[PDB]
Amino acid sequence: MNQQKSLTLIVALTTSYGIGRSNSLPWKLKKEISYFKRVTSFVPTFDSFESMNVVLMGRKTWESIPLQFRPLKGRINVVITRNESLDLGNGIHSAKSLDHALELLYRTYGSESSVQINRIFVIGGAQLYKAAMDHPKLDRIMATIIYKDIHCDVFFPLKFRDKEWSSVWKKEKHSDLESWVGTKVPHGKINEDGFDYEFEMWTRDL
Numbered sequence: 780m781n782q783q784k785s786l787t788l789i790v791a792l793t794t795s796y797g798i799g800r801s802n803s804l805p806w807k808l809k810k811e812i813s814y815f816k817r818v819t820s821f822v823p824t825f826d827s828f829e830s831m832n833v834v835l836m837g838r839k840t841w842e843s844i845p846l847q848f849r850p851l852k853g854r855i856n857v858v859i860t861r862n863e864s865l866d867l868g869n870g871i872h873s874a875k876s877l878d879h880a881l882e883l884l885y886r887t888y889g890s891e892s893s894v895q896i897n898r899i900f901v902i903g904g905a906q907l908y909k910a911a912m913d914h915p916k917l918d919r920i921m922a923t924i925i926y927k928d929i930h931c932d933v934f935f936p937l938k939f940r941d942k943e944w945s946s947v948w949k950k951e952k953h954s955d956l957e958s959w960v961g962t963k964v965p966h967g968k969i970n971e972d973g974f975d976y977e978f979e980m981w982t983r984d985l
């Protein structure tokens with residue numbers, strides 16, 4: 780009713796868990812952003828008829844996305860916001876929280892609907908990551924790790940890759956990565972504009 784699907788989080792962070800700086804991305808990765816697109820837009824062909832995935836984001840992230848690329852094309856876009864008097868959108872929903880966002884969707888995209896949801900993604904920011912991380916339906920993390928310690932002022936809320944969470948978070952094999960995002964993905968490090976990064980998939984039991 781409120782929670783049918785599992786939540787998936789997608790983030791890019793430095794080894795020190797930094798995700799932002801000056802309400803921006805401390806970096807510029809063309810291939811990192813294309814993987815983003817790919818992962819969150821992908822829906823099985825046979826189902827490519829009826830379905831769309833969901834991109835849930837907080838207000839600030841929405842404001843950061845190049846206005847030329849907003850709304851995210853091909854995905855159900857939902858902005859999380861308390862102070863929502865006049866959201867701006869032509870069928871771009873607003874919701875006062877993740878749980879409210881989940882019942883909104885579950886109420887709009889019902890059997891009535893010609894449009895049905897496939898997967899649901901939390902794309903940021905720090906603040907929504909924090910709510911997602913505590914949600915009882917969050918079971919997968921789509922993370923891109925950057926091997927540079929760039930200066931950030933925004934950090935990811937749980938050190939999911941540290942020994943302390945090793946009995947809860949498990950890092951899946953790459954072959955498993957590709958099986959889920961339904962495509963061959965670069966393995967090992969990619970270097971761009973001097974940055975060395977890598978794609979990983981972390982799961983947890985609920």
Ligand SMILES: NC(=O)c1ccc[n+]([C@@H]2O[C@H](COP(=O)([O-])OP(=O)(O)OC[C@H]3O[C@@H](n4cnc5c(N)ncnc54)[C@H](OP(=O)(O)O)[C@@H]3O)[C@@H](O)[C@H]2O)c1
Binds near residue numbers: 861
């Ligand atoms: N590294 C990455 O992958 C990644 C992805 C996205 C963003 N970022 C970065 O993260 C930073 C922005 O961080 P942020 O924490 O300020 O932004 P954010 O979550 O995008 O925006 C926070 C705003 O969203 C709303 N919000 C979020 N969670 C809410 C909840 N549970 N209930 C109600 N409202 C909620 C509030 O909006 P109202 O004021 O509208 O009520 C709050 O001011 C920047 O560095 C941005 O670049 C990084």
Ligand SMILES: CN(Cc1cnc2nc(N)nc(N)c2n1)c1ccc(C(=O)N[C@@H](CCC(=O)O)C(=O)O)cc1
Binds near residue numbers: 812843
């Ligand atoms: C600021 N921001 C948040 C952002 C950026 N990179 C991320 N990277 C990952 N891996 N995960 C995230 N959650 C993420 N979030 C952005 C900024 C731009 C676009 C964006 O324009 N995306 C286009 C891609 C355009 C392109 O290929 O050049 C899209 O259609 O998805 C998305 C999110």
